[PDB]
Structure formats: C-alpha cells, structure tokens
Amino acid sequence: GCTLSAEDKAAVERSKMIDRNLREDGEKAAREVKLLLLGAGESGKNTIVKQMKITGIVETHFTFKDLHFKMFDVGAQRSERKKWIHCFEGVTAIIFCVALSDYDLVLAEDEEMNRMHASMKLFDSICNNKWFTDTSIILFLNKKDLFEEKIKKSPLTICYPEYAGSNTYEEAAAYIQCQFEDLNKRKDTKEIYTHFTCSTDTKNVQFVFDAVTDVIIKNNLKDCGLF
Amino acid sequence: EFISLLAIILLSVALAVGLPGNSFVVWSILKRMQKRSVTALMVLNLALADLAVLLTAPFFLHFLAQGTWSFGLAGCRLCHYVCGVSMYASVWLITAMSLDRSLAVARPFVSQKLRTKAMARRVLAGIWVLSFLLATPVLAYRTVVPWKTNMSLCFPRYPSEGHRAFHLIFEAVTGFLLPFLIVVASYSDIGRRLQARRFRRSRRTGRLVVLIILTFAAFWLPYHVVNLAEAGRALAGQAAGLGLVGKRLSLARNVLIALAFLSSSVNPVLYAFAGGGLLRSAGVGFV
Amino acid sequence: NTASIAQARKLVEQLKMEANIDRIKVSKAAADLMAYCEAHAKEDPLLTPVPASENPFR
Amino acid sequence: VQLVESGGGLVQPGGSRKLSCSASGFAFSSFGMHWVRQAPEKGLEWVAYISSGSGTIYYADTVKGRFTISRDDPKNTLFLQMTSLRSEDTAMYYCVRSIYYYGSSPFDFWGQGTTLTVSSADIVMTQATSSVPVTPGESVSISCRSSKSLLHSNGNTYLYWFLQRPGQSPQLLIYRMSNLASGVPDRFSGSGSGTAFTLTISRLEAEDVGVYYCMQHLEYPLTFGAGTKLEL
Amino acid sequence: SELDQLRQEAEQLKNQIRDARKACADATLSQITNNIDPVGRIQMRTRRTLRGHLAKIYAMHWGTDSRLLVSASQDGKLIIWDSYTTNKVHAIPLRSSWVMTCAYAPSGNYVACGGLDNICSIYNLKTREGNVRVSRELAGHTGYLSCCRFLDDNQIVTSSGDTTCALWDIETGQQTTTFTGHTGDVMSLSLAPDTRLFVSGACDASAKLWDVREGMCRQTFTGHESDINAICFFPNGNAFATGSDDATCRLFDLRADQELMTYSHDNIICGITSVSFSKSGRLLLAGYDDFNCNVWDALKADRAGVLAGHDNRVSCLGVTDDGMAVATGSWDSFLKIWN
Ligand SMILES: CCCCCC/C=C\CCCCCCCC(=O)O[C@H](COC(=O)CCCCCCCCCCCCCCCCC)COP(=O)(O)O[C@H]1[C@@H](O)[C@H](O)[C@H](O)[C@@H](O)[C@@H]1O
Ligand SMILES: CC(C)CCC[C@@H](C)[C@H]1CC[C@H]2[C@@H]3CC=C4C[C@@H](OC(=O)CCC(=O)O)CC[C@]4(C)[C@H]3CC[C@]12C
Ligand SMILES: CC(C)CCC[C@@H](C)[C@H]1CC[C@H]2[C@@H]3CC=C4C[C@@H](OC(=O)CCC(=O)O)CC[C@]4(C)[C@H]3CC[C@]12C
Ligand SMILES: CC(C)CCC[C@@H](C)[C@H]1CC[C@H]2[C@@H]3CC=C4C[C@@H](OC(=O)CCC(=O)O)CC[C@]4(C)[C@H]3CC[C@]12C
Ligand SMILES: CC(C)CCC[C@@H](C)[C@H]1CC[C@H]2[C@@H]3CC=C4C[C@@H](OC(=O)CCC(=O)O)CC[C@]4(C)[C@H]3CC[C@]12C
Ligand SMILES: CCCCC/C=C\C[C@@H](O)/C=C/C=C/C=C/[C@@H](O)CCCC(=O)O
C-alpha cells in the first residue's frame, strides 16, 4: 500500500479491471444450453439439423423461447475418442440419431454386419461411459415412413431372430424402442427420452425443449440441497 | 423447585449438543473450501447466528444456580439484546432458505440469472439489519429489582397492561406465525409441483421436509402459546401471578425457553449433514 | 499389388538406415550424466535453497 | 495514431474556456492521459492527470480547484475545463498518452498542442547547463541533477529524457534512465547514478539540435528541468 | 514372394538392431551411482496462488525472463500473468474454445495456441495500437493439434493427431517440411537447447528423434507398454525422459541407444500427465492423476516429495530458466508457485 510507487498502483488498477471483465464474461457464459450431437454414418442427423432451422468440430447456434442453444457436431474427427471425449464432460444433454429403415442393409465389406446392430453397439458404448454417468440422452428415430412402406414385404425376423410377434408397424416400432431402451445400465442416475421424427413434425424441436426443462429442474434440486 | 433442575438439564444438553457442530461447520466453510457458491454462505450465517444464541447460556445457568443476579443492569440488558437479535436472525434465515428452494423449482430459468453472489450478500445484510431492529423492545423493559434480603434479580417491568399485551402479541406474531406460514406454503407448493416431472426422486427427499416442519413446530409452538395465553389473561383485566392460573402460567414460562435453546443444536445436522443435499456429508473428520 | 511392396521397401530402407549407427557403452553415458549433475550442483536453487534475503518470492 | 487538440484562443482575465482533444488510430480506452503546459519562452510544466477507467484524477498545486479533467470513451474525446483564468495562464497545452503495465513505455506519443493567450515536498530538478557549442561528427554529453533519490526499493529509477525541435512538439527519447524508445537511432544513450544523470550523443547529424528536458516520475506532482539548448 | 522376402528382411534388420543394442549393456545406472549420497527430504511451500480461470486448465509456459507466464483454459481464455506481484498483464479471448496447448516466443513478442480446430493461431503482443491482434493462422493439418514450440520469430513446429509433424515458416504461412512415420497419434514434442533436433512421442508407444534441416526420421525408441502422454529433454542435450499411461516414467539416452532407468511405485496405479527437469538435472518432477505431483531424485530413482494441494488432476507443470520457482496447474482452475 504505502510501499508502492505510482506506476505500481496503476498496474494494480489495470489488473482489477481485467478481473472484473473476466467475472462478467464468466457469469454470462453459464446460461447457455450445450448439446452434443451423435449418430452413426448416414443416420439422418443432417436432416435433423436441417429441420430445426439452423475441418474440426462444427458448431451451430439457435435461439428458442429466449434460450440460447449451442449444438456441437464432431463427426469429422477420425481419431480415437478416448483422447478428446473428456472435453465434453459437462454438457447438458446428448442427442442421438438412428434410422429405422436400416435393419436389413449391409454395412461393411462383410455382409454379416448390418447397420442396426452397429447403431446398437454405438449407443451401448456412449450410454455406459465413465465420463457420462448422469448425463441424459434424447433419442431420435428417423425414416419411419420408409420403414412402414418396407415392412409390407420385408419381415423383421431378418434381423431379430427371436421376434415372435405380428408384422405391423406399431408393434415392430415398439419392439425397436424397447430393445434400445433396454440397454441403459444406469437406470437410477440417468433418464432416456425417445421420439419418432417426421418431416412435418416440427414438434421435434419442442420435444427437445421439454426434455431440457426437466434436466434443468433436477440440477436445481441439487444446488438448493434436497437431493 | 423442579423448574431450576429442568432448565439446568435442558440448557446443559443444548450446549453439549450445539457447540461442536456449529464450531465444526464454521471452521470447515471458512478455512477448508477454495470456493463457496451460495448455499455455503447461508449455512455459514446460520451457524454464526446459532453460536450467537448459544454463547449467552452460562449467564443464565449462573442465574439459575446461584439464585441471584451477579452481573448487573448492563450485563442483563446486553445478554437479552444479544439473544433476541440472534434468535430473530436464525428464524428469518430459515424462512429465506425456504423461499429460495421454492423459487428454484417454480421458475427454473428466472432463478438462473438472479441467484448470484451480489444479491445474496445484499439479502444477508438486509436480514441482519432487520434482526437488529426487531429485538429493540427487550432493551427498554428488563430492569433490576431486589428479590429478598441481599437478593436481586433482573426482569421486565411493564409500566401498564397495554404495554405487556403489545410486547407479547408483537413478539408472537413476528417470531412464529409468518415464518411458519411461509415455510409451510413453500414446501407444499414444491411437493405439489414435483408430481409431473417424470424422473425418479422420491426416496428420502420427502422425509427432510416433514422433519423441518415438525422440528420447527415442536420447539417454537409452546412458548408462543403461553405468550398468547398470558396476553389474553392480561387483556381480560386479570393480573400476572394472581390466582392458580397465573402462577401455573408464570411457572410454565421458565422452562419453555430452555426448550427453544434446543432448535439451535439441530440446524447444522438438518441443513449441512443430512443426506438430502449432502453439503458436508462426504467431508467429515469424525472417524 | 505393388503399393505394399513399396511400403515394405520403405520400411526395410528405414531399418537399414537405423542399423548403421555407432554406439558407446552405458558406463560412459552414466559417467557423463553424473559429471554434468555434479558440476552444476551449487547453482541449483531447489536442490540447495538460498538465504531468504535473495528469494524473489519471499 | 493521431491526437488533435482544439479550443485555444484569446481570453480576457477571469472568464472560462474548455479545451478538447480528439483521438484516432488506437485503443483510446486502454490509455491514461495527461495535460501538460509550456510557457511562451520557458520550460515544460505538468497540469493534470486522468487514468483508464476514470477511477483516479490528479491536479497540480497551482491549478487544483480551478481546473477539471474528464474523458468520453464511446466517442474517444478528452476534455479540460478552466475557470477564473489569470495572467499566468498564457501558454501552449499538449495532450499526452500513457500506459502502465509491467514493461510498458509511458509518455510515448505527444499531440500537437493548442495556444491560450490571456490579456513543498515536490522534487526539484536542475539543468546545470543552458547552451553548448558543438560541430557535426563530435560527441556530446549533458547532465542534470535532482534533490531526493529517484531510485526506488524495487530496483527502478524513474528518469525521462525528451527532445523538442524548432517548430515541433516533444518526442520521447529515454524512459527509466537507460531504455531507448522505439524508433530512435542507437547513437543516443543514458546513464548515471542517484541524484546525477547523464545523456550522451555520439556522431551528431543535422536535424538533431533542439532543447533537451529531463523529468522525474517518482511521485506526484511531476517536475521538469529548465532545458539545455544545444547549438551548432 | 516379394512381400514375404521384404518382411523377412525387415525382421532380420530388427534382429540385427536388437543384437547391436544387446552387446552395449554393461551396468545399470543404479550401480554406477551406489556411492552417491541421497539428496535427503525436499519440502516446498506455496508462495503465490493465481486465480481467475473458470474452467479446466490445459497448458502453461514460462517466459525467458523468469517473470511472466501464459496459461490457457477451456473457458476460451489465454492469460498472461506477472508472477512477482500476481498482477494480470494481458487477457486474450480465443475464437475456438477447445484449446489444448500453449507456446511463448523466446524473444517475448509472440504467443501461439491451438486445439480441436486443426489450426495454429499466432498472436502479436507488442503493437502500436495498445491491443493484441491475431497475426497468423496456420492451416493444413487434418487432426487435432497437440503441441507447438517456437524456434525464432519466423519458424514454428507443430504436432497433430494425423501421425504427422510439421515445420512452418510463419511469414508465408506454408508448410516448409513434413515429418511422417508414426502409426498412432502424436501427443508431445520437445526441442533441444540448440534448435537442431527434436523428439516426439506417439500413441503407438514409441518415440522418434528427428533432424530438422534434413527433414527425415533419425532414430526410434521403444519400451513402454501404453501411449506416451508427455516428453522432456535433459539439459546437456544427450538424454530425454518420457511418461506414459503405465504409471511409469523412463530415461533414454541418444548416444548409447538404450534405456537407463524407470521411475514407478507399487502404490501408484494412475497415469502421468507431464514431466520436467531441474537446472542441474537432479530432480525430475512429474504430475499424476492422484491430484498431486511427485518429485523424483533422478540419479537414484527413489523419492516422492509430494506437492499436495490440488483438488483435481495435475495438467501442466514447469520450471524457470534460472531455476528458482516451480509452477503447477490443474483441473480445479488454480495455479500454484513453489520453492
Ligand atoms: C401460474 C402462476 C405462477 C406464479 C409464480 C410464482 C410462484 C411461486 C414462487 C414463489 C417463491 C418466491 C421467490 C423468492 C425471492 C428470492 O429472491 O429469494 C429469497 C429472497 O429473500 C427475501 O428477499 C425475503 C426474506 C424474508 C421474507 C419476507 C416476506 C414477507 C412479506 C409480507 C408478509 C405478509 C403476511 C400475510 C398475512 C397472512 C394472513 C393471516 C431467498 O434469498 P437467498 O436464499 O439469499 O438467495 C437468493 C438470491 O441469491 C437471488 O438473487 C434471488 O433472489 C433468488 O434466486 C435466491 O433466493
Ligand atoms: C456477540 C454479539 C455482539 C452479537 C454478534 C453479532 C454478529 C454475530 C453478527 C452481527 C452482524 C453480522 C454480520 C453482518 C454482515 C455480514 C456480511 C456477510 O458477508 C459475506 O457473506 C461475506 C462473503 C464471504 O465471506 O465470502 C458475512 C457475515 C457478516 C459479517 C455478519 C457476521 C455476523 C455478524 C457480525
Ligand atoms: C394447520 C394445522 C391444521 C395442521 C398443521 C400441520 C401441517 C401444517 C403439516 C403437518 C403434516 C405436513 C405435511 C406432511 C407431508 C407433506 C408432503 C410434502 O410433499 C413431499 O414431501 C413430496 C416429496 C416427493 O415428492 O418425493 C408436501 C408437504 C406436506 C403436504 C406437509 C404439509 C404441511 C403439513 C400438513
Ligand atoms: C403438541 C404440539 C402441538 C406442541 C404444542 C405444545 C402445547 C400443546 C402444550 C405444551 C405446553 C402446554 C401448556 C402448559 C401450561 C398450561 C397452563 C394451564 O393453565 C390454565 O389452565 C390456563 C388456561 C389456558 O391458557 O389454556 C393450561 C394448559 C397449558 C396452557 C398447557 C397447554 C398445552 C401446551 C401449550
Ligand atoms: C411438544 C413437546 C416437546 C412440548 C410439550 C411440553 C413438555 C416439554 C412438558 C415437559 C415438562 C412439562 C411441564 C412440567 C411442569 C409444569 C408445571 C405445571 O404446574 C403445576 O404445578 C401443575 C400442577 C398439577 O399437576 O396440577 C404446569 C405445567 C408444566 C409447565 C408442564 C408443561 C408441559 C411440559 C413443559
Ligand atoms: C425468534 C423468536 C424471538 C422471540 C424471543 C426473543 C427474545 C426473548 C427474550 O426476551 C428473552 C430471552 C431469554 C433467554 C433465557 C432466559 C433464561 O432465564 C432461561 C432460563 C430459565 C430461568 O431463568 O428460569
């Protein structure tokens, strides 16, 4: 205090102004909604991005009901996920996209590997990670019209050997949704939300809003004690 | 003669239960956290008010044991002012925490841009200022009068009956009714709104609410019931200590406050160590 | 095809280039590291702390 | 970088006036500013100081209570307001830019000044010389002196050297007694020790003649020398 | 059978290299230094604490004057501190938030940063404008950027997840040289104190020594069991120490083409994140996942002078050029200075 010169005092004042600006930016940066986007190759995620009115990481922004949404798409990164996944440890939610009409298509050079089983493996690997033990997932099922058109001549037994039901759209779709939700190994600390997308279904953005609200409320119930 | 033993036992238990917990909470928050968001500040203020209440007990134990007031007019007035201020501060900190939890669920985005350090500190300062203002009528009522041969005691001398009724009714209204109604309404609304949240929570988050309500009521209700009864008998034209009812009321107004010295020993457990909202459950050196 | 042939040829060439290098025994390197460590010891401000009057960090 | 002052003219005794300075070409809101004054035929005299963020203001002993300094950040303007003007307020005023962080160079860019014509623990600085005859290609040495000790306890020594050429405005040469400013030939040097300091020039050229000033920045107020007029 | 013959020749050359490396071993370093007295117990205190970051911290670098620091965090901020008075000298906002590395120019005029956008950004500190500007953006990599180190005001070297390293000329913005040969991702590199060679560590559990002017691989080192997370280089220029995800550190020598010692303990089963040496090369400091960093005697391989005092993983640590202080950062968003 009394052992400082004038120049030292000016330096101190400059440092204090820098601190104040940092604090203001930090307060502003914590009221955004950060979503991480995922889904296997050619699984309708491009259509999902297009519908909601929106190399390295690709980032997208939008604003709905006075809320700022930032979506991160990291599909181009061809490296190992165990080197950059922990950078996303504190996101609000994970959006996952799959395609309903890929249960009888050959994926790789081997004809045995079909696409639906690959999507199931990817979902299993994401859901039960060690850096996402209490992060919620929002699940989108795409191309339902094509699936309904295809099931007339294509039986679902081609991919699920143990299926012992009818050959109608509703029961098959319910079976697929149940077979996906039966992979959550952390049923007490995590929740899964499921939707059936459609072209004219603008509701698929409103759905997202709804899920986010629940998440926010839960987090509040952990700030003010009570949990 | 049973009153002295009862009050001594109650105050000894209250001290032995409520000193270490508040001391540990204050030490941990002040000297072992590298950062404190909001809730830590309010638990710290609750611990400070609890210690301020609990630290003026030895004088009252001395007055109960030696049978005389050996601390003088200044000591009596200072002790009573300190106790009043700290009790009011503790009660209204409880009420503020209740309202905060209610707002965190009624509007989840409005409270994102409001719940911050600056307004927390402004609210705390306002609460403490109001607590200082409210305990005033205790600093101009308690005097000192000789008791027997060489015996003296300090006690309130109400110049009339209207003054006694005013003080008692004002204390009862401003110290139990409004905080209780606010807490009840807030937690009822929380429990009603949670019913449509479609995530699984109801294992031990309904127990804490009921414990809070019951702990508040069981400790602060009898004293204010007696307050209202005495005020009613005063407004009826009767006189304090006149007859059987007055004696039984005046004899029942020396143990209830020793019971209210107990709610300052359960707040640290009920707001910092209880599992629901484990702020300090994980970090304990008690093993 | 022949791309694998070219890749294997590159690997063989790199291995051949590495194989022709002069070497010294481990004891010499041990002695050299020992000498460099022992010849600058007195000027290490962490191995041997300095009096609290010369410390810029107090 | 460009500072332009305006507001000068003729003022009768008493009265009041307001000087302004417009900045362009740099981040005006990160710099502190000074107002400095020069008499018609005397040395430089400091006037006022404002800092970045407006959280500090300083005046001089002979002006405090009469002058007022202010800044406008969104529009990048600086203002001085003077009232009750006496006959000792006839001079030319300059606006000076200054920035303070570890390793910066303050007092680096000076304005062009505007004229105004009206119809003790401070450190004293002494320019021991008033004129020197020299010839081109030689070497020159000038020295000045203080009263207190300019060397602080952290190791700095706050002495500044400026040049003013005929018909121009001052131009920083040396800051903190040994550090050469950016854009200055390497034939200038500064040295010395407590209370006695020396500037040195080697192999003079033309356009290198004028008046040299030595200033201190150890504490407020800031005090100038009287100047040495090197001649050729 | 041309491919089979080429593979057989490769195996024969590998066996010849192994035989050459086998015949040069006489005595382990722990035998030549059995008469060295231990350095005793080493205790350090926290002199300063630097606060202001609001997220995890991924990199820091020391200036050559031993007075200034730069640090990068995932809140999108790069901060330059004065470490004697704990004053802030500069604060710079980045364009991409996912930063992973830092570098500070040896002169003092420039800083650099990169990350998950496949770009290296270079910033100019000393302008005529008072602010800091973006001077250059270097593009041409296809995977994330994990390290970068200046050589002078004009040349820089970077490492990416493509398995490739690159040497760039800043003025034109063009890749002057490319270094290829790793199979997995490259995670770190360390220059030499003459700017003539450098070393690189990769996720295929290997290290490579490269010559800069020629532009080709010169030597390779193996021996770990998992990927390598950090690499450092001995002061005299003839050794370097690595830290992998095995809970082990190791020392390799260029001239003998061998391995010297391993530093590991049975109670440590986590991964190392960063290593560094001391001025005389008598103390190897290493950060760990246990939330604290250890100090190892470097010639006897027996010490842990724990620098406890962090609440999360230690990301980065460094030592000044004069050698009086040590700095550590971590995922709890605090920096600490010790001596
Ligand atoms: C469809 C219809 C929709 C309806 C919408 C509303 C519905 C339900 C919501 C009701 C909840 C009320 C909102 C809380 C206000 C508040 O601000 O909280 C609290 C602020 O205390 C106070 O000022 C008051 C303290 C003491 C209470 C005083 C109230 C008394 C008023 C008059 C009483 C009259 C009696 C009536 C007679 C009854 C007849 C018998 C806790 O403060 P604290 O914990 O310190 O922290 C804060 C800061 O950090 C941050 O700035 C923000 O204030 C908060 O986020 C955070 O609470
Ligand atoms: C023993 C008798 C005299 C009663 C003692 C009264 C004190 C116990 C009360 C009265 C005023 C209260 C203070 C009023 C204002 C505040 C500001 C408040 O601000 C903060 O929360 C600081 C934030 C931080 O510490 O990070 C801290 C509590 C404090 C000091 C209160 C502490 C407790 C005080 C001193
Ligand atoms: C006013 C007089 C006539 C009665 C005084 C007693 C009541 C004020 C107390 C006693 C029982 C309390 C109730 C006990 C149980 C609950 C459930 C509680 O809801 C939850 O705990 C939800 C928990 C979850 O959803 O997991 C809401 C408060 C409420 C209604 C309490 C409201 C306040 C009550 C009625
Ligand atoms: C049980 C829960 C709701 C806590 C509430 C405690 C009260 C119900 C108990 C504790 C103290 C008791 C009192 C202790 C002393 C007396 C004085 C006694 O003397 C009289 O006859 C006065 C008449 C009257 O005022 O009721 C009447 C019972 C009463 C009020 C008791 C009424 C019941 C009280 C208030
Ligand atoms: C909700 C619970 C925690 C509060 C209930 C009050 C209780 C703590 C009990 C325990 C001791 C009881 C007291 C024991 C002694 C007396 C003296 C008694 O006066 C008599 O002489 C009664 C004589 C008779 O029995 O006729 C008046 C009731 C009172 C205050 C009792 C009131 C009710 C008290 C305080
Ligand atoms: C938040 C509610 C505020 C209402 C109470 C406030 C002040 C009580 C104040 O007037 C009196 C306090 C007395 C405390 C202790 C009194 C002792 O005498 C108790 C021992 C019993 C005895 O003395 O017989």
Author numbering:
A (entry chain B): 2 to 55, 182 to 354
B (entry chain A): 15 to 301
C (entry chain D): 5 to 62
D (entry chain E): 2 to 120, 136 to 248
E (entry chain C): 2 to 340
Sentences from the paper on this structure:
Leukotriene B4 receptor 1 (BLT1) plays crucial roles in the acute inflammatory responses and is a valuable target for anti-inflammation treatment, however, the mechanism by which leukotriene B4 (LTB4) activates receptor remains unclear. BLT1 and BLT2 belong to the class A G-protein coupled receptors (GPCRs), and can be further classified as members of lipid receptor subfamily which includes prostanoid receptors, sphingosine receptors, lysophospholipid receptors, cannabinoid receptors etc. The binding of LTB4 to its receptors (BLT1 and BLT2) activates leukocytes and prolongs their survival.
Here, we report the cryo-electron microscopy (cryo-EM) structure of the LTB4 -bound human BLT1 in complex with a Gi protein in an active conformation at resolution of 2.91 Å. To facilitate receptor expression and complex assembling, we use an engineered receptor, which contains 4 thermostabilizing mutations (L1063.41W, A1965.53I, C2877.55F, and S310A, superscripts refer to the Ballesteros-Weinstein numbering) adopted from the MK-D-046-bound human BLT1 crystal structure. The native ligand LTB4 is well resolved in the ligand-binding pocket of BLT1 as it binds the receptor in an extended conformation with the carboxylate in the aqueous environment at the entrance to the orthosteric binding pocket. The pocket is mainly formed by a cluster of hydrophobic residues from transmembrane helices (TM-2,3,6 and 7), including F772.63, L782.64, F742.60, M1013.36, Y1023.37, W2346.48, Y2376.51, F2757.43, and I2717.39. We identified a direct polar interaction between N2687.36 and the C1 carboxyl group of LTB4, and a cluster of water molecules that connect LTB4 to the key polar residues of the receptor. The distances vary from 3.0 Å to 3.3 Å, in a good range to form ideal hydrogen bond, therefore these densities are highly likely to be water molecules that connect LTB4 to the receptor. Together, these water molecules form a hydrogen bond network that connects polar residue N2687.36, R1564.64, R2677.35, and H943.29 to LTB4 to lock the ligand in the pocket. Particularly, the hydroxyl group of the C2 position of the inositol ring forms a hydrogen bond network with D1143.49 and R129ICL2, and the hydroxyl group of the C5 position of the inositol ring forms hydrogen bond interaction with the backbone carbonyl of L128ICL2.
